[PDB]
Amino acid sequence: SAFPVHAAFEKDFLVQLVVVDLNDSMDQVAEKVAYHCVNRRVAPREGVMRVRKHRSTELFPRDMTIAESGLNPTEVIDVVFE
Amino acid sequence: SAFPVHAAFEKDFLVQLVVVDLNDSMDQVAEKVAYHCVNRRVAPREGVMRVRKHRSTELFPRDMTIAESGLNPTEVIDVVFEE
Amino acid sequence: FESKKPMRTWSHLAEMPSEYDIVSRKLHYSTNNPDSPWELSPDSPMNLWYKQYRNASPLKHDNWDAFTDPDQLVYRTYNLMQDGQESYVQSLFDQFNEREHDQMVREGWEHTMARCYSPLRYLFHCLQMSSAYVQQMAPASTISNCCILQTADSLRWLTHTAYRTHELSLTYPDAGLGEHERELWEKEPGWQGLRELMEKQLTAFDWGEAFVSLNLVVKPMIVESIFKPLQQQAWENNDTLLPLLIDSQLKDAERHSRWSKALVKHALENPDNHAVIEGWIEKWRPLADRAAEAYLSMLSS
Amino acid sequence: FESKKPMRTWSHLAEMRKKPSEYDIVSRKLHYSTNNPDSPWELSPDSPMNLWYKQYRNASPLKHDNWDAFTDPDQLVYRTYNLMQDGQESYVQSLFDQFNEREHDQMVREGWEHTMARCYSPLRYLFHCLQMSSAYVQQMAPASTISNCCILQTADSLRWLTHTAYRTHELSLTYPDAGLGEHERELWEKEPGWQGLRELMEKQLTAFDWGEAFVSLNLVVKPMIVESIFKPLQQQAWENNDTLLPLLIDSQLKDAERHSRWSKALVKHALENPDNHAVIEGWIEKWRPLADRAAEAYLSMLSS
Amino acid sequence: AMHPRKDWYELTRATNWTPSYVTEEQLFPERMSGHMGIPLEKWESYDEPYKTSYPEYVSIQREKDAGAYSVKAALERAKIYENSDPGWISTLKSHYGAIAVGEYAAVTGEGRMARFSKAPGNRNMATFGMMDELRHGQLQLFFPHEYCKKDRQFDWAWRAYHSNEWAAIAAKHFFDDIITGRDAISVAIMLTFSFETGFTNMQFLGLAADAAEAGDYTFANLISSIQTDESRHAQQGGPALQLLIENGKREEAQKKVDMAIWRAWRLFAVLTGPVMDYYTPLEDRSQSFKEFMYEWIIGQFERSLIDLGLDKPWYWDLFLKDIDELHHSYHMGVWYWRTTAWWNPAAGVTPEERDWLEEKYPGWNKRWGRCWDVITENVLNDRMDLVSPETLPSVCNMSQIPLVGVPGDDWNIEVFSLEHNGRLYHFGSEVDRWVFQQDPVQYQNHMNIVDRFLAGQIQPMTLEGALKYMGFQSIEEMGKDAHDFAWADK
Amino acid sequence: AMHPRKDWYELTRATNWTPSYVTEEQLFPERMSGHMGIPLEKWESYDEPYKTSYPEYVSIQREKDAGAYSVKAALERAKIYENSDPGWISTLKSHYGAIAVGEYAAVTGEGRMARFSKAPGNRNMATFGMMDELRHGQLQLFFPHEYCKKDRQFDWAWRAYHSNEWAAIAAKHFFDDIITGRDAISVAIMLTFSFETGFTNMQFLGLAADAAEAGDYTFANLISSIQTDESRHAQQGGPALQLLIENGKREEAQKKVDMAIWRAWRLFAVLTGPVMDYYTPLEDRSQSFKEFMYEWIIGQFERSLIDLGLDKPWYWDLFLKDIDELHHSYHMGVWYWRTTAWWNPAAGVTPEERDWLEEKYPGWNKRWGRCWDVITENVLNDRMDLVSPETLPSVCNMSQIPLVGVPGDDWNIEVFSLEHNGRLYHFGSEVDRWVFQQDPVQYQNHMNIVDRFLAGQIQPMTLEGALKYMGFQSIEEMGKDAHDFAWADK
Ligand SMILES: [Cl-]
Ligand SMILES: [Fe+3]
Ligand SMILES: [Fe+3]
Ligand SMILES: [Fe+3]
Ligand SMILES: [Fe+3]
Ligand SMILES: [Mg+2]
Ligand SMILES: [Mg+2]
Ligand SMILES: [Mg+2]
Ligand SMILES: [Mg+2]
Ligand SMILES: [Mg+2]
Ligand SMILES: [Mg+2]
Ligand SMILES: [Mg+2]
Ligand SMILES: [Mg+2]
Ligand SMILES: [Mg+2]
């Protein structure tokens, strides 16, 4: 159930390939993306990591799964705070 | 009354032109040569200085002058310490 | 990955280099990926062009890159050699002009030159265009390099012809020299065999057919049926310049024959290529025959 | 002693220049042997070579305030001479190769090989005399800019000698029974048509005054060779279906014309002193009759 | 005597004729010629401004090579490899890999014009162009060959274009688009006017100066020599553009220039931007990359376009903004993913260097500095795991370079995507997507390296598998920090 | 086709003939030809071993200059003058002054043979020799000219031979004796066999290596290029010696070799000896001057002489002793009288260097070390008056170099004098006196600079008056300590 996304993490300089799973929650998706950004090129922060379609203003629910999100493989997401 | 000699001073590395006077004694000639050698390339030494024709064994008397000596201009002399 | 020491030459050469090998060998990365010669859509127009006219050529070898110019020329040594040849031609032109050579040719020779010599600039430029085509399509950089130098040599001949066309016109201003050559190329019967031959040859787009038709048929015909007869006629008409100029051009032409014959030898390592090369020679030879015959009838007229 | 700034070029040029030509930098005022009129060379003033130079250079009737100011009109240096001549030799060597390939020599008119053996191949002696004579003017000339023209002219003479050696051998391959490469010394020594030229050169080679040497060699001998040897040989070659020789001679005549050019420039320089007109004219009148006799004898032989 | 070139030059390009045994279109098919339907006779007005002739060419070029090779030989004891700054050695490695076999590819762009251009003067100048680019390809193989014995990364002077290394794919995608993959008139416009006249001419002048500063006179001389060839063939585009404009194809001409300048810029930003602002020692930086773009590239484009009767491309303000930002992110990426490069990137973020960056790019520290702060503290704590990547960057489906933006306090990153014939494409700028849509058949089925990764072509499906796919053959070939992290010591 | 040189070469030197209109002796006067009464026919046996032809010559020499000048141009902005060690700069200054216009003088030696040698092969090879030395003179003027604007001492590249500076007089007295002031066969023997084959070949090879070590690749390349010309004309002497021996003139051949080798040695010891053992940085000394003389000059002479059927010169044991001693005294003199040189001598007597000198010349510190001890103490006490002379050294009437000996513990100095035709001459060795007596008419009325001083030719009669006479034109031109005495406080 591998599910590739292209993810841009808040305050990082690029978009990266992150392969997540169809049944991952958004919380779990954010954690998998953060692994490749936080304490590498982005300072660690308190606050809730949220996922959204790239450049959109609406956030996915934290416990919504990739499978029910309406996202398609290889679409671009942002991982942001608050 | 200038008189040119070529002089080699004991322990120096070369022969130099030194212009002396017909009426200079050999002592005075040795001092004029020494001026151009001692404390320049040759360590100062105590002792009487003597003059001889180059590579000669015989020395000129100390109070003999250049004119008295029969030396000819541009001949070579050694200046060496007394034995 | 493991640790490895530096190699003394390129990795592709190291398990076996001349200056020639170092700077000439295996540079066409466009042969690496059969379905995508170029780093573009596999169906981009130029990728389709190369897949048809290079990759799919009926002339086949598993290692075209192993071809070696028998003269092993590089840009540096080509210019050394050709500067010497152009020094020769420059002194030829300068000194023959000083002694008013063109005034001394036999009566009427200027009209033979206007008709049979000055329009060669069109033939030579066709060779130039054609050699550039074989350059860009050939499946090995060592082959392409021979074609580059041959393209340059063709421009060399064109330039010689331009210079002498103008110069001759200074002594013979009423012969149409430098004025009538396009019309002759287009309409004079003696040129129409050559023009038909080159128009058709320039639209043979398979790299192998292009090479065989140009270098094994057209160019040897030009040596035997144009260059050499022109020398003989010149001598007979007290033109001592043209044969000496052609001597230097024939040096280029023999070099073209030398690398061409070496490429055929390479190709024939695949026994299937004999029939393919022979088939193209048999196809093109009749056009070349007619080109020669029409030209020689015009030259002898 | 005072403090002075660096000079941008040599001190001898630094007044009138900031950056002279390459030619000036490497050619001008190099004969230190003219600095001391009593001792050209740093030896006894009466050493044999000092006596020679005081007599045959310094005391020449040909006089000038400033020979060093002479300038080669071509301003040639070693580097630019070799560039030029490598080109000319590429031309000639290519001609040799191509004419050999088409067996040019076998197609000359009947008898031409005998005219070549008699009138062409012994030119190696004449050309070597020119080489020797040019070297003499080199070593005696009172300015390095004059001497440099002479060096290059010595080299050109050797160039011509070498052409002649090459072609003598080559022609003998096609014509083995004409004495080519075998009889030239005897011809030079004993054949009437060569004796004018031989007498001329033996006498010219023993004119040791630098000025007389220059005038006899470059204003009399060498122009005669152009007019009475090179050009007639050229015309006769064409008439005999020898196409190579005239082309070869045209390359050699390019050298000869260059020699004429710097020679004319030296005369113009010399004539800044009006006394030199009579000196040069006198030497030309002295030597021309020998040169004319040489030409006439050669031409009778050529045409026989 | 010799007759002056001006008296016989016209006969050298009096070579057009009216075909009869084949048609004009068969002889010059539009797909290879790019004549846009403009008939033969109109092309005879084409006039190259800087003329030359074969005898002159072989004479001057003989002299040029005599110098270039004599200097190389005379300085072989200088030991540049051992005595140069690591920054300079990496500059050489990057340059030779990105350029040498690309120069040889340019022979084919020139050959395309030599055969298929309808303009006689173009066909002749392109013949000299074939020879020039042959020279440049051979020079830039012969010279780095000397260093093979010192360092396997110099093998990439030959190997890069034969590889699937990501920067090599970006170079090949660009050069196959503007040099080898389009018709003759497109090559004239995109290669000779937009790329060579527009970028490489001034770049090579800059690089030769840099080489002298680095004490590498063999390379300074080599690059200077190559630059003196440029105008002879780079001149071909101008007259082509004039001809198009005069014959109703202004918008077509503008479009090709627009496309080529942007594509050149993105590659230039990844290859040269980091060298100028980060690899070059601080004391030897005469100006910033931005100042260079403004001084030597942008203004020249503006005035050369106006002279032709063209306009500044539609994206000019985007271009200007990009010069402030793009190469800083590209540099960060090349360094963080240094193991995928065939040279050793210099981080270039010592305190004194960051002061210079702040001066040249006000606000640099609040942007890229935030990332380098994290990286720098990790280096100081010897957290090598945190300065080594474990995933791939997302890659532009046009430039083949990763998708970047501005980091830190002004975080802004934008991907421009496109659904096209059932496939989702991603682009690193509005202009790159536009280029795609201008000629989709050129691009649409191309797979970038991440597409191949996702499609199963790269095994194992890991960064390690990707390094193997990219053509690395030993541990030593993969990029490392140019200074072994000594920069963090102070 | 072309015919190989062996097929036609003989005809190029088939140029002797029997004169009729003048005599053989008129055409080839003994004073200019040096044929020693040997008739023309015998000279036809002369056979130069290494054949050359004109087309080959202009082609090869064209290539050599292409390289030499292109290297100079490409290194123009490398700032060698500013970045070289002072010892190297002084080495350059000394070299160019002593050599450049002397090379041009060698044209005349070669020209003497070209006109007056009775051997045809000699006359042709001498013609190439004229050309070779023209090259060398022009090269060695063009190359230092660049430095004039930096340093007035480089003016002496041109000025030295035009001056009465003492070392210039020594050089001119030697070169006018062996190159320009004798008959053709003497030139062949004394210049091409003795000096060029015998000394300059190995000297130039050594100097090119020293240049590379010093980082001066332009000069390294230049000197190497010049050395490649030497064999072409230096070959002329051997065949001339063989011919003399074959024709009953062995005694005369030996005498001329004996003379030439000794005269070359004394000048070599003053010009190159100090450079090798004192100017060259200690770390870059591969062998001592003595070791160089032994293993590259003396042994090679021994073997070449035996090969020709000649003997070691009578003075060989004196020669061997001299290489232990002479140049140490010459160096001391050049340094102490440095104000009279156009270069800046390096003292070369730091403790580390004195240790090396002691290793290479056991007993050095007991001898020359004693003088340097006094000099060093005076420098430390800033007694500049005591490290600058007031008087003139006595000068050899042959070599024109001052009369020296061994100083210190083992003091020994010997002047060899001669009364001749009413005048008293002084010589620096038994051999120098012997050379004078071999050919007194060459030498007898020459006045050395001290003779001139005593004859009232130099006013004022002081060392300062002498400096003016020697041609110095500013304070800057006069020699100073190369390191501004930095070596003393070490
Ligand atoms: Cl001082
Ligand atoms: Fe290029
Ligand atoms: Fe280019
Ligand atoms: Fe020399
Ligand atoms: Fe020499
Ligand atoms: Mg779960
Ligand atoms: Mg397909
Ligand atoms: Mg094979
Ligand atoms: Mg006309
Ligand atoms: Mg038929
Ligand atoms: Mg004077
Ligand atoms: Mg004047
Ligand atoms: Mg570690
Ligand atoms: Mg004092």
Side-chain angles (χ1 to χ4, degrees), chain D residues 3-180:
Chain D
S3 175
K4 296 180 183 175
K5 301 175 175 288
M7 298 160 291
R8 297 189 170 266
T9 184
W10 307 129
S11 52
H12 72 95
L13 302 172
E15 239 64 69
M16 74 193 110
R17 316 284 182 66
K18 298 295 180 176
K19 180 173 297 182
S21 64
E22 179 185 8
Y23 175 86
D24 283 339
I25 291 164
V26 306
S27 310
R28 183 87 51 191
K29 206 178 168 66
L30 302 185
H31 286 343
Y32 58 87
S33 60
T34 64
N35 289 343
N36 186 338
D38 188 39
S39 297
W41 306 113
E42 188 73 54
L43 305 164
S44 184
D46 312 271
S47 78
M49 200 66 72
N50 268 336
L51 295 180
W52 186 278
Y53 272 69
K54 283 189 274 191
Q55 172 168 359
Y56 292 122
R57 180 197 270 163
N58 293 4
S60 180
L62 196 68
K63 311 275 203 205
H64 197 284
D65 264 1
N66 194 358
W67 287 116
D68 271 299
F70 166 78
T71 302
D72 173 8
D74 293 343
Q75 288 182 40
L76 287 174
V77 298
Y78 180 89
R79 179 181 75 72
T80 54
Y81 173 87
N82 283 332
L83 273 164
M84 175 177 65
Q85 292 306 73
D86 180 50
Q88 278 303 298
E89 283 299 89
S90 293
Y91 173 60
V92 171
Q93 306 302 127
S94 296
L95 294 172
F96 286 169
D97 183 30
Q98 303 157 195
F99 277 92
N100 171 95
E101 282 296 312
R102 67 172 74 93
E103 302 291 351
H104 163 276
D105 290 346
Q106 80 175 127
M107 301 315 309
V108 303
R109 192 170 68 184
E110 199 81 279
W112 180 242
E113 69 272 25
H114 301 298
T115 303
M116 291 290 280
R118 195 143 160 264
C119 305
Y120 173 74
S121 51
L123 285 172
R124 75 170 183 258
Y125 291 92
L126 176 59
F127 294 159
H128 189 64
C129 287
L130 300 176
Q131 185 185 340
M132 291 168 66
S133 188
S134 301
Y136 186 70
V137 187
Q138 173 275 317
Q139 63 204 256
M140 299 313 306
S144 49
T145 48
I146 300 169
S147 293
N148 287 5
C149 294
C150 293
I151 298 164
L152 304 181
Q153 176 177 309
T154 307
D156 291 340
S157 303
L158 175 53
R159 177 184 189 238
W160 303 354
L161 168 52
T162 305
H163 292 153
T164 313
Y166 186 92
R167 279 295 294 152
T168 297
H169 167 67
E170 183 164 51
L171 197 62
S172 81
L173 296 179
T174 296
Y175 300 107
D177 298 321
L180 291 158

Side-chain angles (χ1 to χ4, degrees), chain F residues 110-156:
Chain F
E110 296 285 347
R112 197 85 64 216
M113 294 187 290
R115 164 63 180 86
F116 290 108
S117 177
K118 282 194 180 173
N122 187 190
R123 295 195 299 266
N124 285 0
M125 288 308 91
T127 297
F128 292 118
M130 291 165 75
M131 288 290 281
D132 288 347
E133 305 296 13
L134 177 65
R135 183 188 185 226
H136 299 172
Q138 296 195 336
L139 285 169
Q140 287 177 110
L141 290 169
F142 187 80
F143 274 62
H145 182 264
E146 176 186 338
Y147 295 139
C148 287
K149 68 177 72 67
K150 302 181 184 69
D151 192 321
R152 289 184 69 95
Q153 285 180 332
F154 275 104
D155 191 57
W156 285 73

Side-chain angles (χ1 to χ4, degrees), chain E residues 112 198 212 222 266 391 400 436:
Chain E
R112 199 83 67 211
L222 167 77
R266 298 293 282 211
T391 193
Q400 314 301 306
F436 182 98

Side-chain angles (χ1 to χ4, degrees), chain A residues 4 6 8-17 35-36 39-43 52 54-55 74-76 78 80, chain E residues 329 332-333 336-337 371 374-375 378 385 388 390-392 394 403-405 407-408 411-415 426:
Chain A
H6 297 288
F9 196 90
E10 186 172 328
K11 291 192 168 194
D12 201 1
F13 83 100
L14 83 173
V15 190
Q16 291 175 305
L17 171 64
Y35 176 87
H36 296 288
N39 280 316
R40 293 175 178 272
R41 298 173 306 275
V42 173
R52 72 185 186 201
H54 183 49
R55 287 266 135 194
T74 75
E75 292 189 337
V76 182
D78 300 337
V80 303
Chain E
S329 283
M332 182 170 287
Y336 198 88
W337 276 263
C371 301
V374 178
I375 289 162
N378 282 335
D385 56 324
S388 301
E390 289 189 25
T391 193
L392 307 190
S394 309
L403 307 174
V404 300
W411 180 58
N412 179 65
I413 184 163
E414 181 159 11
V415 180
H426 301 297

Side-chain angles (χ1 to χ4, degrees), chain C residues 118-129:
Chain C
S118 49
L120 287 167
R121 69 169 186 258
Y122 290 94
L123 176 62
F124 293 156
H125 187 65
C126 288
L127 299 178
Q128 183 183 340
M129 293 168 67

Side-chain angles (χ1 to χ4, degrees), chain C residues 84-85 87-89 91-92 94-96 99 231 235 238 240 243-244 247-248, chain D residues 86-88 90-92 94-95 98-99 102 234 238 243 247 250-252 254:
Chain C
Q85 289 300 305
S87 281
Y88 160 83
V89 171
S91 292
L92 194 68
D94 198 352
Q95 295 181 33
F96 277 52
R99 67 178 173 83
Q231 291 186 303
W235 286 119
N238 203 39
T240 52
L244 291 176
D247 279 337
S248 179
Chain D
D86 180 50
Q88 278 303 298
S90 293
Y91 173 60
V92 171
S94 296
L95 294 172
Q98 303 157 195
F99 277 92
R102 67 172 74 93
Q234 202 167 34
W238 287 118
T243 292
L247 306 186
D250 265 355
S251 178
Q252 298 168 336
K254 186 175 172 291

Side-chain angles (χ1 to χ4, degrees), chain F residues 133 136 196 230 233:
Chain F
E133 305 296 13
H136 299 172
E196 293 177 315
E230 203 68 46
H233 59 265

